[PDB]
């Protein structure tokens, strides 16, 4: 498709960035990024023209976004921020992100690795292209770790050194906030997010981000246990799934004050139920656990846990003594239903007697 046009236009187009990496990992990807030596915008517009789809141009950035089916295509002009593909590649973050593949007809199927990205790919290594990479873009401080968290990659010696230097320089605090917030929002999406938190604690990034935040053993243990709970719940009910990456965050900020924690969650643009679970965690959770341990009957637990959010219950599953109760509610208590004739005899106040009968049966 594209290579044809690149030939017709006498340009040179390349699949570029992490997409190439994911292809080398065999990962299926429907979002594809290109870098073009030529007019990238004209190439893209011609592509969309031939395919007869819509194309959104961006002259300012020098890029164009067009979508075909559910497959999304971006076409960027080669730049040093004309410039060669190598220049556009060397300005990126890491070696695994530094490669590209030609869709051009002659060299089609050729992977281009200048920096040994493929060499450093098999060794499970996160390696920056230039030594000032971190001071250049402080967000990378997190990013590297994030990658190292997901792919189980180890940082190269120089990379680690420069990382801890940049961190110690406090560039994290003086870095643009929105970018950091977005990167952290990107980190929670990972299922390897806990390992990323491990690297976070190791290189002490959160301490330079969140005000008055420090680490203790209890939080860590509760995070591991939280992972256990998450795994179990994801296992049992696959249709009840939610965003788990937030809960861990709620475990991290649980010690912090309500005001700055609220400001922080608002700063993260978190979902409603998350902030609601936070507010309910701060104030009324203690009395909740109190009267939960004091519950002699299962129906009272039903009444208590019914208005609660699912996340709240999953968070209540942490307590060793409260586990079987929560499990009972999930797989038994809430599944109680009734017949017809009984309802009709009750009708000869309704919901009252309904809860009365629930109170009758649910205690067995």
């Amino acid at each position: 498709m594209v290579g044809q046009i690149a030939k017709e236009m006498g340009l040179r187009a390349y699949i570029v960035g992490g997409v190439v990496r994911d292809i080398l990992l065999g990962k299926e990807v429907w979002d594809v990024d290109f870098v073009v030596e030529g007019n990238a915008i004209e190439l893209a517009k011609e592509l969309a023209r031939r395919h007869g789809v819509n194309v959104h141009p961006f002259p300012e950035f020098g890029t164009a976004h067009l979508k075909i089916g559910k497959l999304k295509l971006e076409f960027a002009t080669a730049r040093r921020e004309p410039a060669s593909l190598k220049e556009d590649l060397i300005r990126r973050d890491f070696t695994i992100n530094a490669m590209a593949i030609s869709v051009n007809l002659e060299d089609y199927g050729t992977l281009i690795d200048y920096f040994g990205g493929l060499r450093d790919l098999k060794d499970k290594v996160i390696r920056v292209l230039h030594p000032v990479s971190f001071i250049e873009d402080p967000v990378r401080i997190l990013r590297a770790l994030r990658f190292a968290g997901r792919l189980n990659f180890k940082l190269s010696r120089s990379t680690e050194k420069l990382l801890k230097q940049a961190v110690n320089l406090g560039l994290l605090k003086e870095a643009p906030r929105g970018r950091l917030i977005n990167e952290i929002k990107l980190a929670l999406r990972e299922d390897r997010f806990l390992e990323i938190l491990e690297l976070y604690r190791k290189y002490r990034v959160l301490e330079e981000i969140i005000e008055g935040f420090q680490w203790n053993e209890k939080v860590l243990q509760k995070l591991y246990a939280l992972r256990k709970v998450v795994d179990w719940h994801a296992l049992e009910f696959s249709e009840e799934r939610i965003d788990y990456g937030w809960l861990y965050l709620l475990i991290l900020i649980s010690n912090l004050d309500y005001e700055r924690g609220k400001h922080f969650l608002e700063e993260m643009s978190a979902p409603s139920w998350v902030r609601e679970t936070y507010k309910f965690m701060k104030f009324k959770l203690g009395s909740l656990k109190e009267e939960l341990k004091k519950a002699k009957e299962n129906y009272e637990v039903y009444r208590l846990l019914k208005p609660l959010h699912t996340s709240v219950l999953l968070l209540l599953m942490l307590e060793e003594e409260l586990k079987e109760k929560i499990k009972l509610y999930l797989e038994k208590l809430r599944k109680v239903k009734l017949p017809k004739e009984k309802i009709e005899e009750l009708k000869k106040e309704l919901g009252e007697r309904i809860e009365e009968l629930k109170r009758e049966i649910m205690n067995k």
Side-chain angles (χ1 to χ4, degrees):
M1 309 292 113
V2 175
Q4 319 181 30
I5 304 184
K7 182 64 175 63
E8 297 171 12
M9 279 184 165
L11 315 180
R12 303 203 50 80
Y14 304 90
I15 305 183
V16 169
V19 190
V20 167
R21 167 202 65 212
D22 289 337
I23 290 185
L24 297 189
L25 305 183
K27 285 172 56 66
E28 159 188 331
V29 280
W30 302 142
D31 295 35
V32 187
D33 313 311
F34 296 89
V35 167
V36 187
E37 301 159 331
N39 189 321
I41 308 172
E42 284 306 316
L43 199 155
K45 292 177 66 176
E46 245 283 358
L47 187 66
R49 190 195 66 91
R50 288 177 183 264
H51 280 282
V53 302
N54 191 15
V55 45
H56 308 149
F58 289 95
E60 310 84 12
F61 288 90
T63 75
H65 290 69
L66 77 100
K67 184 166 183 172
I68 290 177
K70 72 174 182 178
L71 196 151
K72 307 170 70 176
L73 297 168
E74 180 202 343
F75 287 88
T77 311
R79 51 188 162 83
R80 43 189 59 99
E81 188 198 11
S84 71
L85 179 62
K86 188 184 178 185
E87 298 182 16
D88 191 279
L89 291 190
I90 198 178
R91 69 176 172 83
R92 299 186 180 274
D93 32 332
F94 312 105
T95 47
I96 53 181
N97 311 340
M99 290 174 298
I101 314 175
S102 164
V103 282
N104 305 288
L105 296 177
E106 54 270 21
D107 49 12
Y108 203 123
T110 299
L111 177 64
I112 316 178
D113 182 21
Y114 306 102
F115 319 98
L118 182 55
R119 151 69 188 170
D120 295 315
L121 217 165
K122 65 169 185 175
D123 310 324
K124 294 183 177 179
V125 173
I126 301 300
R127 181 182 306 276
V128 288
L129 305 184
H130 49 103
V132 276
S133 186
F134 284 132
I135 307 183
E136 178 172 289
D137 182 27
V139 187
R140 289 168 171 144
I141 291 177
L142 306 187
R143 288 183 62 94
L145 304 181
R146 175 163 61 91
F147 281 166
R150 189 217 305 177
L151 316 171
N152 191 19
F153 273 31
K154 318 185 71 61
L155 302 166
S156 67
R157 311 154 196 83
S158 52
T159 297
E160 181 185 5
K161 298 166 189 175
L162 296 161
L163 197 151
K164 301 181 71 172
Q165 281 206 19
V167 172
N168 192 270
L169 290 180
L171 299 188
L172 212 50
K173 183 179 295 296
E174 291 184 354
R177 219 59 173 87
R179 305 191 56 173
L180 303 182
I181 267 64
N182 284 23
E183 160 64 22
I184 296 180
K185 284 182 63 178
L186 221 169
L188 55 88
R189 302 177 61 173
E190 315 282 327
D191 288 313
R192 296 290 109 251
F193 169 65
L194 201 62
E195 287 81 359
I196 306 181
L197 285 186
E198 239 282 348
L199 298 179
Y200 278 7
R201 177 173 64 95
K202 180 183 177 183
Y203 298 101
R204 313 180 182 278
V205 293
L206 300 192
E207 300 83 313
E208 290 287 343
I209 297 176
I210 313 176
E211 290 290 333
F213 176 73
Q214 285 190 4
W215 300 80
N216 60 88
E217 191 70 24
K218 186 63 60 59
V219 176
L220 194 62
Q221 304 296 337
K222 294 181 80 69
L223 279 176
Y224 281 85
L226 177 61
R227 183 172 63 178
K228 306 178 186 303
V229 179
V230 164
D231 298 340
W232 184 92
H233 185 65
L235 168 65
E236 297 291 337
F237 313 93
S238 61
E239 300 176 5
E240 292 193 17
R241 295 180 186 177
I242 56 179
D243 299 328
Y244 301 98
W246 294 113
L247 292 184
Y248 298 79
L249 176 57
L250 299 182
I251 296 293
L252 292 177
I253 66 183
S254 59
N255 295 89
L256 294 188
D257 298 338
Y258 168 75
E259 288 72 19
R260 54 192 181 187
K262 169 182 176 298
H263 159 55
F264 172 76
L265 288 180
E266 290 175 346
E267 186 176 345
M268 291 286 296
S269 298
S272 60
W273 63 276
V274 177
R275 280 178 284 189
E276 291 176 327
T277 305
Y278 180 72
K279 177 184 179 179
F280 207 87
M281 181 174 62
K282 304 303 292 182
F283 286 88
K284 311 177 187 301
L285 186 60
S287 181
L288 173 60
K289 300 180 306 175
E290 165 62 84
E291 298 171 355
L292 183 53
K293 296 180 179 59
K294 290 291 184 58
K296 53 190 86 291
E297 59 175 358
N298 331 330
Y299 166 77
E300 186 171 1
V301 187
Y302 163 78
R303 174 196 58 87
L304 286 173
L305 302 186
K306 184 180 179 181
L308 284 182
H309 195 269
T310 300
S311 58
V312 185
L313 312 180
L314 301 180
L315 198 54
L316 285 178
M317 233 200 74
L318 289 184
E319 315 304 309
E320 180 64 29
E321 59 280 354
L322 299 179
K323 290 173 63 66
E324 292 184 321
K325 299 182 179 182
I326 300 297
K327 191 176 180 301
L328 174 63
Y329 173 81
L330 294 176
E331 292 166 349
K332 275 300 181 181
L333 302 183
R334 62 181 182 178
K335 299 183 176 304
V336 172
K337 301 183 179 183
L338 291 175
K340 294 186 177 181
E341 272 190 350
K342 306 188 178 185
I343 306 180
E344 304 169 354
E345 288 186 354
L346 298 183
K347 294 183 177 183
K348 295 180 179 178
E349 55 168 2
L350 178 64
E352 302 176 354
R353 184 54 185 181
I354 287 177
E355 295 302 322
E356 288 186 26
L357 293 185
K358 286 175 179 170
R359 181 179 174 89
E360 300 291 336
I361 312 180
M362 212 169 301
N363 291 332
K364 300 177 181 179

